């Protein structure tokens, strides 16, 4: 009686992997940095009741996962330049230029901006990818991150 909606979420450590997933799951932001689970949260997107099936990590997960989230720190210039490699991995474990991903910019809310949204926009666009400026902090864009995730695994496969 729902769909199974399988999400990971990688990119390097700090960024707020577990922030963001604990915003959605708690609707709580965790302060403190605790740097691998799975967590599940039904939540109805577009009238469908979605189970989404949720990996926070630091090949085994991207090659079941059926988007991903690529997260970065807009004040974390080297992880803006690590999603090159987050993102060449996912697609060598799939084979494809067509898997459903989002690019999300995190910690929107802090001032120390040296990733502008050019940079991110240039990127996603070259992906041909959406890019979702977040902060786990306010919950700005969080619920957006994930639902425009399940529209693009919906976009690319039937559910
Ligand atoms: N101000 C602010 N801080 C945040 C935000 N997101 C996460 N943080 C903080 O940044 C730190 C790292 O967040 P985490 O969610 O643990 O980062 P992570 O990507 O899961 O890191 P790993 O588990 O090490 O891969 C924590 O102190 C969070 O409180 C944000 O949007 N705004
Ligand atoms: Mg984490």
Not at 27 to 52: A, M, W
């Amino acid at each position: 009686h729902m769909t199974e909606y399988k999400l990971v979420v990688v990119g390097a450590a700090g960024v707020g992997k577990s922030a963001l997933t604990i915003q959605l799951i708690q609707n709580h932001f965790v302060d403190e940095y605790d740097p691998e689970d799975s967590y599940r949260k039904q939540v109805v997107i577009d009238g469908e009741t979605c189970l989404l099936d949720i990996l926070d990590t630091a090949d085994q997960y991207m090659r079941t996962g059926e988007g991903f989230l690529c997260v970065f720190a807009i004040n974390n210039t080297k992880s803006f330049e690590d999603i090159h490699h987050y993102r060449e991995q996912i697609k060598r474990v799939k084979d494809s230029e067509d898997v459903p991903m989002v690019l999300v910019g995190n910690k929107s809310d802090l001032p120390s901006r040296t990733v502008d949204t050019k940079q991110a926009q240039d990127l996603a666009r070259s992906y041909g990818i959406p890019f979702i400026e977040t902060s786990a902090k306010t919950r700005q864009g969080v619920d957006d991150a994930f639902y425009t995730l399940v529209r693009e695994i919906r976009k690319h496969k039937e559910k």
